[PDB]
């Protein structure tokens, strides 16, 4: 018996060789492979297949290969591939990617993906499923930023801050043992994974290190606290001992050094270079040349993504507010102004496209939009397809290679950089079930459902007083995963090894899952999935022209983007 | 007033429709959320007027046409559902493919 | 061209379901007075007792129809359906409790079926 492809895709989501448009972009992803057995597809509903004695096994207890949750017929978009599969979750973790159902009567059932009495079902047929976004440049300034991030598919917030204090409004820093402990306790009520960065500043080891022992998951070196050769050096020495990542916002002022001085202080050690283009901060004008080095893990923040006709005009006042500058101070204005360059922003687009800048991040509330990391990643990929064409690496009008390059910037690469990719960052077996479903029409704009540790945490859903959940108003709402003590089991607080070994979680009464930061000192640019290019980046000091391999990297600002006015109410 | 949860929430649909109607009156092609709001508030107000569910299921297809909205908006909206207090109590109105 | 956000561009060709499995066409009658709708993955011999058909020809089989669809029999309606073979371990448990094991045990299945009044045990 045969089903035409149009009808097949309508019923079960797309299969091998079918292509899906991403939102209202010009990007097309193609199904690369499909783990199903045609005719034994799992589905749930009245008179469907996942029913006792049929696609649901009525024999096995939960421990015997039965899933807690089966996502049926997902179109996975991940660094590991773009393919069709069932996703099986158990104990909060992804335990099987393959084909779920009942081995009694179905062919090809992955052995640990049995739908049994214990199995909950989420229908993903027709959806695109990605890992939760990993935002490693977060300022904790306003607790309302968490729903904003969940709504655009972000499930991990790494950064610093104590609320709307000027230190935190400028810098991703939670300074010292007490602020750290306070924010670890606060984190117990935030329905997202969190990792906290200590102040990466000091000329002695102990003041820096005690932050790591107190529970920080990494360090931030920021010029507003003095991004000197000493603070850089001491922070990397702490990090190398503690096995945590250091993020840097370097000395824009070139006050104690130029870029080559910062690199000399870094001394080949691993470091995550935040907002590498430099509008968000860094040696003027040539901080973006850090993204060519093998020991640098380079990220962009999002207000320069991608290069548009209004990008430059918004930047002056934004910067002045974030860094507590005064327009009535000319050197303040000069400092601000030196950071804002069309030349480097235009080249930043291309560097992303070439896999030279490996990661995206928001910079939430301190020159960055908490809910637009995923959004602007896809806008950039779309603008690059339009201006530069499909990449050479693609096959048959599909944008799969670009899609894998770009999805990696906000999922697996930030996780790798932070030392948390054993837990999160991708849809792989063994990793925490942080999953985002998207309708293709809303891909990258508004997440359908956000799954945190195997339970839906956030959903676009309608009137709670209605007969069914689809009537208006459909809006993003926290779900049962955020409620009561479930908030503890579905979210991870990432901490250093020494704080975990010193019993900080018990000391502070933390009930959240505790994740271990590890393996971040022996990684480099080569470990950035699909974004591993090292090269000599030349930035002309007088014209700010960017060159790679002898060629100028330039492109035009666009007047319009997709994933914008078709979707947003404001 | 004794507002319950739904009454408070549904006020925002009326407000979003008012917003979208001003945008349409100054000549803009409406986007997705705007078009949904307009048709949703149309339904709820129609229920307040005492129209039947069957009437609104059909009237809902003629509130906005494809030239009212941006490219691709018609095909984004498979249906619009809304519940409101009719003369006979709360009922659900499902408008299939409201914009052609 | 006209953008429909999230639209598919499906490949060419057709999907053959239950490929490589024996197919069998049988005639089935709803002898009851209320409608009976049978899903794609129910062991066919274990369907409602009032469906009349050669019950032996349902053993180890199910409807050869797209996963999640069904065959609907109105009261008194007789029609032909095509079956396919169960796959996997070819075991059936629960449902109407006619098999609870290998579907190879025809003999036992038919005996239970007949005893409980499942029509058509030949
Ligand atoms: Ni910065
Ligand atoms: Ni920042």
PDB file of N, CA, C and O in Angstrom, chain C residues 79-105:
ATOM      1  N   UNK C  79     -17.414  -5.645   4.344  1.00  0.00           N
ATOM      2  CA  UNK C  79     -16.485  -5.118   3.346  1.00  0.00           C
ATOM      3  C   UNK C  79     -15.178  -5.869   3.344  1.00  0.00           C
ATOM      4  O   UNK C  79     -14.927  -6.715   4.211  1.00  0.00           O
ATOM      5  N   UNK C  80     -14.388  -5.654   2.297  1.00  0.00           N
ATOM      6  CA  UNK C  80     -13.092  -6.319   2.237  1.00  0.00           C
ATOM      7  C   UNK C  80     -12.051  -5.365   2.826  1.00  0.00           C
ATOM      8  O   UNK C  80     -12.116  -4.152   2.613  1.00  0.00           O
ATOM      9  N   UNK C  81     -11.104  -5.927   3.567  1.00  0.00           N
ATOM     10  CA  UNK C  81      -9.991  -5.156   4.087  1.00  0.00           C
ATOM     11  C   UNK C  81      -8.705  -5.914   3.749  1.00  0.00           C
ATOM     12  O   UNK C  81      -8.724  -7.160   3.644  1.00  0.00           O
ATOM     13  N   UNK C  82      -7.606  -5.177   3.679  1.00  0.00           N
ATOM     14  CA  UNK C  82      -6.314  -5.864   3.487  1.00  0.00           C
ATOM     15  C   UNK C  82      -5.544  -5.867   4.795  1.00  0.00           C
ATOM     16  O   UNK C  82      -5.492  -4.822   5.478  1.00  0.00           O
ATOM     17  N   UNK C  83      -5.038  -7.015   5.192  1.00  0.00           N
ATOM     18  CA  UNK C  83      -4.218  -7.133   6.394  1.00  0.00           C
ATOM     19  C   UNK C  83      -2.738  -7.218   6.037  1.00  0.00           C
ATOM     20  O   UNK C  83      -2.365  -7.684   4.952  1.00  0.00           O
ATOM     21  N   UNK C  84      -1.892  -6.855   6.999  1.00  0.00           N
ATOM     22  CA  UNK C  84      -0.456  -7.092   6.895  1.00  0.00           C
ATOM     23  C   UNK C  84      -0.054  -7.897   8.116  1.00  0.00           C
ATOM     24  O   UNK C  84      -0.876  -8.112   9.016  1.00  0.00           O
ATOM     25  N   UNK C  85       1.171  -8.368   8.173  1.00  0.00           N
ATOM     26  CA  UNK C  85       1.671  -9.176   9.265  1.00  0.00           C
ATOM     27  C   UNK C  85       2.158  -8.302  10.418  1.00  0.00           C
ATOM     28  O   UNK C  85       2.778  -7.270  10.162  1.00  0.00           O
ATOM     29  N   UNK C  86       1.901  -8.732  11.653  1.00  0.00           N
ATOM     30  CA  UNK C  86       2.578  -8.092  12.783  1.00  0.00           C
ATOM     31  C   UNK C  86       4.072  -8.261  12.604  1.00  0.00           C
ATOM     32  O   UNK C  86       4.485  -9.251  11.973  1.00  0.00           O
ATOM     33  N   UNK C  87       4.879  -7.390  13.199  1.00  0.00           N
ATOM     34  CA  UNK C  87       6.339  -7.502  13.041  1.00  0.00           C
ATOM     35  C   UNK C  87       6.948  -7.734  14.415  1.00  0.00           C
ATOM     36  O   UNK C  87       6.202  -8.131  15.326  1.00  0.00           O
ATOM     37  N   UNK C  88       8.162  -7.254  14.648  1.00  0.00           N
ATOM     38  CA  UNK C  88       8.815  -7.355  15.942  1.00  0.00           C
ATOM     39  C   UNK C  88       8.944  -8.784  16.413  1.00  0.00           C
ATOM     40  O   UNK C  88       9.139  -9.683  15.595  1.00  0.00           O
ATOM     41  N   UNK C  89       8.610  -9.075  17.663  1.00  0.00           N
ATOM     42  CA  UNK C  89       8.653 -10.413  18.209  1.00  0.00           C
ATOM     43  C   UNK C  89       7.452 -11.268  17.823  1.00  0.00           C
ATOM     44  O   UNK C  89       7.365 -12.445  18.190  1.00  0.00           O
ATOM     45  N   UNK C  90       6.439 -10.687  17.197  1.00  0.00           N
ATOM     46  CA  UNK C  90       5.213 -11.356  16.830  1.00  0.00           C
ATOM     47  C   UNK C  90       4.598 -12.054  18.042  1.00  0.00           C
ATOM     48  O   UNK C  90       4.275 -13.230  18.086  1.00  0.00           O
ATOM     49  N   UNK C  91       4.399 -11.255  19.094  1.00  0.00           N
ATOM     50  CA  UNK C  91       3.737 -11.614  20.309  1.00  0.00           C
ATOM     51  C   UNK C  91       2.654 -10.579  20.596  1.00  0.00           C
ATOM     52  O   UNK C  91       2.848  -9.425  20.212  1.00  0.00           O
ATOM     53  N   UNK C  92       1.546 -10.987  21.184  1.00  0.00           N
ATOM     54  CA  UNK C  92       0.468 -10.068  21.538  1.00  0.00           C
ATOM     55  C   UNK C  92       0.004 -10.375  22.953  1.00  0.00           C
ATOM     56  O   UNK C  92      -0.067 -11.550  23.310  1.00  0.00           O
ATOM     57  N   UNK C  93      -0.080  -9.330  23.780  1.00  0.00           N
ATOM     58  CA  UNK C  93      -0.464  -9.486  25.173  1.00  0.00           C
ATOM     59  C   UNK C  93      -1.654  -8.575  25.411  1.00  0.00           C
ATOM     60  O   UNK C  93      -1.733  -7.509  24.785  1.00  0.00           O
ATOM     61  N   UNK C  94      -2.582  -8.966  26.269  1.00  0.00           N
ATOM     62  CA  UNK C  94      -3.684  -8.109  26.646  1.00  0.00           C
ATOM     63  C   UNK C  94      -4.655  -7.916  25.500  1.00  0.00           C
ATOM     64  O   UNK C  94      -4.899  -8.853  24.740  1.00  0.00           O
ATOM     65  N   UNK C  95      -5.196  -6.706  25.361  1.00  0.00           N
ATOM     66  CA  UNK C  95      -6.237  -6.431  24.394  1.00  0.00           C
ATOM     67  C   UNK C  95      -7.469  -7.251  24.766  1.00  0.00           C
ATOM     68  O   UNK C  95      -8.133  -6.864  25.730  1.00  0.00           O
ATOM     69  N   UNK C  96      -7.756  -8.339  24.059  1.00  0.00           N
ATOM     70  CA  UNK C  96      -8.917  -9.155  24.409  1.00  0.00           C
ATOM     71  C   UNK C  96      -8.498 -10.416  25.137  1.00  0.00           C
ATOM     72  O   UNK C  96      -9.309 -11.301  25.395  1.00  0.00           O
ATOM     73  N   UNK C  97      -7.226 -10.536  25.484  1.00  0.00           N
ATOM     74  CA  UNK C  97      -6.673 -11.678  26.189  1.00  0.00           C
ATOM     75  C   UNK C  97      -6.886 -12.993  25.438  1.00  0.00           C
ATOM     76  O   UNK C  97      -6.992 -14.060  26.046  1.00  0.00           O
ATOM     77  N   UNK C  98      -6.808 -12.939  24.111  1.00  0.00           N
ATOM     78  CA  UNK C  98      -6.946 -14.149  23.298  1.00  0.00           C
ATOM     79  C   UNK C  98      -5.596 -14.776  22.991  1.00  0.00           C
ATOM     80  O   UNK C  98      -5.461 -15.960  22.675  1.00  0.00           O
ATOM     81  N   UNK C  99      -4.513 -14.003  23.028  1.00  0.00           N
ATOM     82  CA  UNK C  99      -3.192 -14.481  22.640  1.00  0.00           C
ATOM     83  C   UNK C  99      -2.251 -14.594  23.822  1.00  0.00           C
ATOM     84  O   UNK C  99      -1.842 -15.695  24.222  1.00  0.00           O
ATOM     85  N   UNK C 100      -1.919 -13.474  24.473  1.00  0.00           N
ATOM     86  CA  UNK C 100      -0.981 -13.461  25.578  1.00  0.00           C
ATOM     87  C   UNK C 100       0.217 -14.379  25.345  1.00  0.00           C
ATOM     88  O   UNK C 100       0.492 -15.275  26.139  1.00  0.00           O
ATOM     89  N   UNK C 101       0.988 -14.082  24.309  1.00  0.00           N
ATOM     90  CA  UNK C 101       2.149 -14.827  23.910  1.00  0.00           C
ATOM     91  C   UNK C 101       2.435 -14.741  22.428  1.00  0.00           C
ATOM     92  O   UNK C 101       2.044 -13.838  21.674  1.00  0.00           O
ATOM     93  N   UNK C 102       3.074 -15.795  21.918  1.00  0.00           N
ATOM     94  CA  UNK C 102       3.366 -15.898  20.515  1.00  0.00           C
ATOM     95  C   UNK C 102       2.068 -15.938  19.718  1.00  0.00           C
ATOM     96  O   UNK C 102       1.097 -16.600  20.094  1.00  0.00           O
ATOM     97  N   UNK C 103       2.063 -15.281  18.554  1.00  0.00           N
ATOM     98  CA  UNK C 103       0.894 -15.389  17.679  1.00  0.00           C
ATOM     99  C   UNK C 103       0.961 -16.714  16.910  1.00  0.00           C
ATOM    100  O   UNK C 103      -0.018 -17.088  16.254  1.00  0.00           O
ATOM    101  N   UNK C 104       2.049 -17.483  17.014  1.00  0.00           N
ATOM    102  CA  UNK C 104       2.158 -18.781  16.363  1.00  0.00           C
ATOM    103  C   UNK C 104       1.187 -19.810  16.944  1.00  0.00           C
ATOM    104  O   UNK C 104       0.943 -20.874  16.380  1.00  0.00           O
ATOM    105  N   UNK C 105       0.710 -19.562  18.159  1.00  0.00           N
ATOM    106  CA  UNK C 105      -0.190 -20.471  18.849  1.00  0.00           C
ATOM    107  C   UNK C 105      -1.603 -20.235  18.358  1.00  0.00           C
ATOM    108  O   UNK C 105      -2.571 -20.007  19.105  1.00  0.00           O
TER     109      UNK C 105
END
